[PDB]
Amino acid sequence: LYRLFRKSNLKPFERDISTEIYQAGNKPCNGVAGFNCYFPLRSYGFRPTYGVGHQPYRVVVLSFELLHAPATVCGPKKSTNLVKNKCVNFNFNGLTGTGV
Amino acid sequence: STIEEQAKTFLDKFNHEAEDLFYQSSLASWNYNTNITEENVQNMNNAGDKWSAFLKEQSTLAQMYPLQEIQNLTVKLQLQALQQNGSSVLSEDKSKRLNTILNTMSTIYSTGKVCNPDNPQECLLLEPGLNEIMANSLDYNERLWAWESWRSEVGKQLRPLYEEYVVLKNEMARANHYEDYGDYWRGDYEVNGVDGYDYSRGQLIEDVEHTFEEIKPLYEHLHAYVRAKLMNAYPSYISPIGCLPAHLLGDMWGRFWTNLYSLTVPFGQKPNIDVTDAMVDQAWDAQRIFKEAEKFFVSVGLPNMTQGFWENSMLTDPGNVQKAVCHPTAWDLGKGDFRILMCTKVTMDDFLTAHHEMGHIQYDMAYAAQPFLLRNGANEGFHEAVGEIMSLSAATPKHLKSIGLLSPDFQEDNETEINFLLKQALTIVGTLPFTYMLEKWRWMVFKGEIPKDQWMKKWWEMKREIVGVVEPVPHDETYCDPASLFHVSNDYSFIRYYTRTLYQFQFQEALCQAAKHEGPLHKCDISNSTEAGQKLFNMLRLGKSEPWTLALENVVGAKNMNVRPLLNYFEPLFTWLKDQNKNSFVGWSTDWSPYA
Numbered sequence: 001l002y003r004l005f006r007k008s009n010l011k012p013f014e015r016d017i018s019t020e021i022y023q024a025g026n027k028p029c030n031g032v033a034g035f036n037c038y039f040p041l042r043s044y045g046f047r048p049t050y051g052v053g054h055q056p057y058r059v060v061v062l063s064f065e066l067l068h069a070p071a072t073v074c075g076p077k078k079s080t081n082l083v084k085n086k087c088v089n090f091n092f093n094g095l096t097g098t099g100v
Numbered sequence: 101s102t103i104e105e106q107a108k109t110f111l112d113k114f115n116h117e118a119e120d121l122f123y124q125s126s127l128a129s130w131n132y133n134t135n136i137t138e139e140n141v142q143n144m145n146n147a148g149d150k151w152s153a154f155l156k157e158q159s160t161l162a163q164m165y166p167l168q169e170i171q172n173l174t175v176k177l178q179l180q181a182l183q184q185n186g187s188s189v190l191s192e193d194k195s196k197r198l199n200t201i202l203n204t205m206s207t208i209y210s211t212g213k214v215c216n217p218d219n220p221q222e223c224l225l226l227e228p229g230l231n232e233i234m235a236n237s238l239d240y241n242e243r244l245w246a247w248e249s250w251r252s253e254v255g256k257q258l259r260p261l262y263e264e265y266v267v268l269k270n271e272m273a274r275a276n277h278y279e280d281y282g283d284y285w286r287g288d289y290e291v292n293g294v295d296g297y298d299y300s301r302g303q304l305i306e307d308v309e310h311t312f313e314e315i316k317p318l319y320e321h322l323h324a325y326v327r328a329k330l331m332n333a334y335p336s337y338i339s340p341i342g343c344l345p346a347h348l349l350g351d352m353w354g355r356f357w358t359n360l361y362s363l364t365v366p367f368g369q370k371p372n373i374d375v376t377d378a379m380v381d382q383a384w385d386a387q388r389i390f391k392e393a394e395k396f397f398v399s400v401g402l403p404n405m406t407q408g409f410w411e412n413s414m415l416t417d418p419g420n421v422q423k424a425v426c427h428p429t430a431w432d433l434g435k436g437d438f439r440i441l442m443c444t445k446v447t448m449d450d451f452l453t454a455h456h457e458m459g460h461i462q463y464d465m466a467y468a469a470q471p472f473l474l475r476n477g478a479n480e481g482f483h484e485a486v487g488e489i490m491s492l493s494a495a496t497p498k499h500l501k502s503i504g505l506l507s508p509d510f511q512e513d514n515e516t517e518i519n520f521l522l523k524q525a526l527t528i529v530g531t532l533p534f535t536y537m538l539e540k541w542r543w544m545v546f547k548g549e550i551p552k553d554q555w556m557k558k559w560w561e562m563k564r565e566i567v568g569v570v571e572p573v574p575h576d577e578t579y580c581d582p583a584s585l586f587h588v589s590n591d592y593s594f595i596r597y598y599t600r601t602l603y604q605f606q607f608q609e610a611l612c613q614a615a616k617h618e619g620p621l622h623k624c625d626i627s628n629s630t631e632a633g634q635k636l637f638n639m640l641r642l643g644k645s646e647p648w649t650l651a652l653e654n655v656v657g658a659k660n661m662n663v664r665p666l667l668n669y670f671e672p673l674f675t676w677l678k679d680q681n682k683n684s685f686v687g688w689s690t691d692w693s694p695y696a
C-alpha cells in the first residue's frame with residue numbers, strides 16, 4: 001500500500017508509519033475521513049495485464065552510513081593459490097614480505 | 101485551507117482511482133467481446149453502470165468548489181469534463197422515465213424486424229446484409245420495394261417516442277446551463293477564458309452554412325458527373341440536370357454513394373490498385389500484416405504499440421470454439437495496456453481497418469501524461485480522426501510499391517488514381533453534406549423554431565437545398581421519414597462525424613509538409629521522415645488538458661473550420677470533375693419529381 005497522503009515530504013532516513021488524514025482545509029476532518037477528507041496510502045490496484053512502468057519493483061538501495069566510525073563490513077578480497085619452495089611476494093593476512 | 105488545495109487533492113486522487121475503474125470496465129468489455137460466454141455479459145452489467153455512478157458521485161462532490169478562481173486551467177478542464185451529471189438534472193421522474201423509455205425505444209429500432217404483407221418469410225434486418233438488398237440489389241424496383249417495406253415496418257411506432265423525446269429533453273439541459281439538449285454534444289469542447297484557442301457553441305451553426313461556397317465546386321461537381329453515369333441502369337428515372345430518388349443510392353437516405361461506383365466507373369478498362377494478389381504470395385495474416393505495417397510505423401519516429409498487445413489479443417481466428425466480436429471499434433483500455441479489437445485477413449478493407457485501431461493506440465499512448473478524465477482527443481471528432489488517417493494511409497500507391505504488394509515499376513494508370521479518388525469520395529465527401537444540411541436543420545429544430553406539425557413535411561422541402569435527395573412521393577404524418585437513422589434515434593454525437601470530416605485531410609497535409617510530396621497528394625506516407633513524426637507528435641499528445649487546437653493551429657495552420665484541405669485532397673479529382681462535366685449540367689433542379 002504505497003502512501004499517497006502526507007503533510008510534507010520525508011526527511012533522510014525518515015520513516016512514516018501513521019496513516020494520518022492529510023488535512024488541507026482549516027475545517028476539522030475528525031473521525032472518519034469522509035466529506036472533503038480522505039485516507040492515505042492509495043492501493044496499487046495492479047492487474048497482470050499492464051504496460052512497462054505499472055508493475056512492482058523491489059529496491060534494496062544502499063545508504064551505508066560511512067561516518068568516521070571504523071569499517072566493520074569490508075570486501076571479500078578472495079585468495080590465490082599457495083606456492084611452496086620458491087620465492088613469492090606473499091601478502092598473508094595483511095603482513096607483506098618476500099621469501100620461500 | 102483553500103479551494104485550490106482540496107480541488108487538486110481530490111482530482112489527483114480521482115485521476116488514478118477512476119482510471120482503475122475505467123480499466124476494469126475496459127477489461128470486462130474486452131473479455132466479453134473476445135469471449136462471448138454465459139457470464140461475460142455480466143462484464144457490462146456491472147461496468148458501465150458503476151462508471152456512471154462513480155462519475156455522478158465525483159461530480160456531486162466536485163461541484164461544491166467554485167472551480168473558477170483556481171489558477172490552473174486544466175483542473176477546470178477536467179472539472180468541466182466532470183460536470184456531466186447526466187440523466188436527472190431538472191427532475192428525477194421526468195428524466196428517468198424518458199431514459200427508461202429510451203432503453204426500450206432504441207432496442208425496438210435495433211430489433212430490425214420486417215413483416216412484409218406479401219409474405220412474412222421475407223424480412224429486412226439492420227445487418228450489413230441489407231446492403232445486398234437495398235444498397236446493392238440487382239433489380240431496380242427491388243430497391244424501392246425494400247425501402248418502402250423497411251419504412252412501413254420499422255417506423256410506424258417511432259414517431260411519438262421521437263416527438264416526446266425532442267419536446268421534453270430541452271429543459272433537462274436548459275437547467276444544466278446548456279441551450280437545449282443538443283448543446284450537450286455541440287459544445288463539448290467549448291472552453292472560455294483564453295482567446296484565440298477558444299470555441300463558441302453558437303459559432304458552429306452559423307459557420308456550417310457559409311463554409312460550403314468552395315465545397316460546392318467539388319461536391320456538386322462530383323454529384324453531377326456521377327449522376328450522368330446512373331442513366332445506364334435507371335431508365336426514365338434519372339434526370340441528370342435535376343435530382344434522383346432516395347432509393348437510387350448506396351444509402352437509403354443519402355449517406356453513402358459509393359455503392360454506385362461499380363456502375364459509375366470513369367474508365368472501366370483498368371481496375372484500381374489492389375493488394376489481394378499480393379497475399380497470393382504468402383497470405384499475410386493479422387500477426388503478419390501488423391508486423392509489415394511497422395515499415396511505415398517504426399520509420400515515422402514514434403515508438404511501437406504496447407508490448408502487451410502482442411500477448412493478449414487473438415491473432416488468427418477468435419472463433420475456434422469461442423464466440424467473439426471483431427467489429428471496427430476504437431478502444432482506449434487505459435493503464436498502459438492498449439490493444440486492437442480486430443483480426444486482419446486477406447482483404448483490402450481488413451488491411452485498412454488493421455491500421456485504424458493501432459493508430460488509435462499510438463494516439464492514446466502519446467498523451468499518457470494527460471489527466472484520466474482528460475485522456476481523450478481534442479474533441480469527439482479528433483480522437484478517431486488521426487487514428488483513422490493512418491488506416492487511410494495503408495492504400496498508398498507510392499507506398500504499396502515498397503513491400504511486395506506492387507512491383508515498383510508499374511506506371512500509374514490514366515484514371516486509376518482518379519478512379520480510387522472517386523470511389524473513396526462518395527463515402528466521405530458524399531456524406532459530409534448530410535451532416536451539413538440535415539444535422540444543421542436538426543440543431544435549428546432543437547432550438548425550438550419548428551412547430552409541432554412541421555417535422556415531416558419540411559424535411560422534403562429543405563432536402564431540395566444542398567444534398568439534393570428527392571423522393572417520388574411525399575408522406576403525411578403516418579410514416580417515419582426524418583428520424584429513421586440508427587444514429588438519429590438517441591441524439592448521437594454527430595460532431596464526432598462533423599469535425600471529423602471538416603478536419604479530415606488537414607492532418608495528412610500537415611504530415612506531408614516536411615515529407616516533400618508536392619506533385620502527388622491524397623496518397624503519401626510518412627515513412628523515413630522524422631520531422632513529420634515529430635511535428636504531429638504534438639497533435640497526438642495534445643489531449644484535453646491542452647487546448648483542442650494548440651498543435652492544430654501551430655502545425656496545420658487552420659485553427660477554425662477549414663475548406664482548403666478537402667479540396668486539395670481531391671484536387672486531381674476536383675479538376676477532373678470540373679473538366680469532364682461537358683455536355684451536362686452541374687446544378688440540381690430540385691423543383692422536379694418523376695412520379696408526378
Ligand SMILES: *[C@@H]1O[C@H](CO)[C@@H](O[C@@H]2O[C@H](CO)[C@@H](O)[C@H](O)[C@H]2NC(C)=O)[C@H](O)[C@H]1NC(C)=O
Nearest residue numbers: 395396399498499501502503504508625627628
Ligand atoms: C525507407 O528506407 C528503407 C531503408 O533504406 C527502404 O526500405 C527498403 O528499400 C529497399 C530499396 O533500397 C527495398 O528492398 C524495400 O523498399 C525496403 N526493404 C526492406 C528490407 O525494408 C526505403 O527507402 C524506405 N522504405 C519504404 C519506402 O517502405
Ligand SMILES: *[C@@H]1O[C@H](CO)[C@@H](O)[C@H](O)[C@H]1NC(C)=O
Nearest residue numbers: 159160163164183184185276
Ligand atoms: C451536478 O450536480 C452537482 C451536485 O448536486 C451540482 O452542484 C451541479 O450544479 C450539477 N450540475 C453541474 C453542471 O455540475
Ligand SMILES: *[C@@H]1O[C@H](CO)[C@@H](O)[C@H](O)[C@H]1NC(C)=O
Nearest residue numbers: 108171172173174175645646
Ligand atoms: C496547472 O497548475 C499548476 C499548479 O499546480 C500551474 O503551475 C500551471 O500553470 C497550471 N496549468 C494551466 C494550464 O493552468
Ligand SMILES: *[C@@H]1O[C@H](CO)[C@@H](O)[C@H](O)[C@H]1NC(C)=O
Nearest residue numbers: 394403404405406407409410
Ligand atoms: C517496440 O519497441 C519496444 C521497445 O520498448 C518493444 O516493446 C518492442 O521491441 C516493440 N513493440 C512492438 C513491436 O509491439
Ligand SMILES: *[C@@H]1O[C@H](CO)[C@@H](O)[C@H](O)[C@H]1NC(C)=O
Nearest residue numbers: 135136137138420421422423
Ligand atoms: C473463453 O473461451 C474459451 C475458448 O476459447 C472457453 O474456455 C470459454 O468460451 C471461455 N472461458 C471461460 C468462460 O472460462
Ligand SMILES: *[C@@H]1O[C@H](CO)[C@@H](O)[C@H](O)[C@H]1NC(C)=O
Nearest residue numbers: 366367512513514515516680
Ligand atoms: C488519358 O485519356 C485521355 C482521353 O480521355 C487522353 O488525354 C490520354 O489518352 C490520357 N491522358 C493522359 C494525360 O495520360
